[PDB]
Every structure is written in C-alpha cells, then in structure tokens.
Write a protein that binds this ligand. Structure first.
Ligand SMILES: [Mn+2]
Ligand SMILES: [Mn+2]
Ligand SMILES: [Mn+2]
Lengths: 150, 149
C-alpha cells in the first residue's frame, strides 16, 4: 500500500541483468520471466552477437599488446576501447540469458558461490588453486528448476 | 558522528572484486594499465569460456535440427557457461581497476537511447535525432578522479 508520503525512487540501482530486461522491452521484444526454450533462430542470433563482441574485445587486447611490444607505456585512457568492448560483451551475454527467460543474477550467484568457495582452498606448490574441504560444485540445473517455480 | 550514525546489495562486478581478494589477485580500486602477461591471461580465459558457450549453443541447435523440443532443464549447461563468461568478462574489467557497473551504465544509456529510434522497413534499428554514443573515455576519466574508496 503506497501513499502521499511514499518515496518512489528506490535506494538501489537496477542490476545489469535488470537493465537488459528493460532494453528488451524497449526494442519491442518483451522477454519471459521464467526459463523458456528458444527457437533456433534466437540461438543463432545470440551466437552471432557473442562472436562479434568477442572478436572486438580480442582486437583491442591485441592492439594494446602490440603497443607494449613496441616499448610503449600504456595510460589509463588507453584502456577505454577495451573497456567499451568488454562492456559490449557483458551486454550481449546478459542479453542471451534474458532472452532465455533465465534470471542472470541467480545463475551468477551460484557460480560465484562455487568459485569463491574454491578460492578458500590451499595452493599447490606451483600455484595451482586447490579445492577446500567440503567443496560443492555449481548446481545450475537446481537454479533453473527453482526459477521455473519461484 | 554518533551512535545514530549507523548499504546496497552487492552487484556482480562487486562479486569479482571479492573473488580477486580471495584468490589474492591484482585488483586496484582505480583504472590501471596492466602488464602484458595479465592481458594474455584475460584473453585466454575469455577464449575458454566463449568456446564452452559456443559448444552448448551448437549442441542445442543440433538437437533442434533433429526435430527435438528442448526443455527448460536442457538450458542449464548453456546458462552455466554464459555465467562463466560473465565471470571472466567482469574479471577482466576488475583486474584493470575499472568499475564495470559505471562502464555498463554508460553503454546501457546509449543502447536504450538508440532503441527509442524508428526502424527501417527491413527491421533494422535506426537512431533517434540527438542520440549520443557511449562515452567510455569520459567514464574512465571520472573513475580516475572520483573520491577515494
Ligand atoms: Mn562492440
Ligand atoms: Mn565454463
Ligand atoms: Mn571503484
């Protein structure tokens, strides 16, 4: 029940995943709330966008590396194109999850849990990260199942 | 400053900063030119996860080509790999000291603005009058001179 005294501006920004949902509504493509098997044309589209942005990211990394090989000292400002493309890559990665009706935050949270837990393990003498006692793998199947009934 | 003096939920970019603390990795608060070894490592990780995503998409398409209806659970391996790709993509921005949420906000702004334009007869999105591209160089500069953490 909201009222004349209510604050409408939320005190926390939408997530990047929430931004994609808003973007898809804007382009007239309002996407599902729950995991939804896609037609093949949607899967081809998503793969095309990933390949495009991944190719742009690789070109910016290559360009920075070529300049370092030539003896150049990079500046913070030199990173803008790489930063821009890494963000474009997040955009189309989130974009794919959103078009699948899969909440990207819920899946990321489960991956993160497993990765963070693995980070609490010891290192092998050569530096390789080992798993700690009690380690449990990411259960993304369980996450997709929950999302279908939440 | 008193006992009355007394906090938003963590974002995925913030999860990477936490992870990098936990593995003891390079993760400056502000944008920082990386050594070449770091750039080669981030590229390898992107290549690995994007290869894994491509394999899951190819598997789904092959099953659809055979006449199969996919289930929601069939999407679990693809979703897992897309999230792994987010992890190493945010990972790269974090190791660069660049606030991924700040850069993304700016890209979102330009993309959402473009979305408001008309479409060509063939469906191609056009820009509206007054559209402004993403100014990431402006974001980076702001991050260099923002107040301290
Ligand atoms: Mn791009
Ligand atoms: Mn993976
Ligand atoms: Mn920051």
């Amino acid at each position: 029940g909201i009222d004349p005294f209510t604050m409408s501006d939320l005190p926390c920004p939408p997530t990047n995943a929430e931004r994609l949902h808003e973007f898809h509504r804007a382009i007239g493509a309002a996407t599902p709330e729950r995991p939804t098997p896609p037609p093949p044309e949607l899967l081809r589209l998503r793969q095309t966008l990933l390949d495009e942005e991944s190719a742009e990211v690789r070109a910016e990394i290559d360009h920075l590396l070529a300049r370092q090989a030539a003896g150049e000292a990079l500046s913070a400002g030199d990173l803008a194109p790489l930063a821009h493309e890494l963000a474009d890559l997040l955009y189309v990665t989130y974009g794919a999850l959103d078009q699948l009706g899969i909440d990207a935050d819920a899946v990321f949270a489960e991956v993160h849990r497993a990765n963070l837990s693995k980070a609490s393990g010891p290192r092998r003498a050569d530096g390789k990260q080992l798993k700690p006692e009690g380690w449990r793998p990411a259960d993304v199947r369980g996450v997709i199942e929950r999302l279908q009934h939440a």
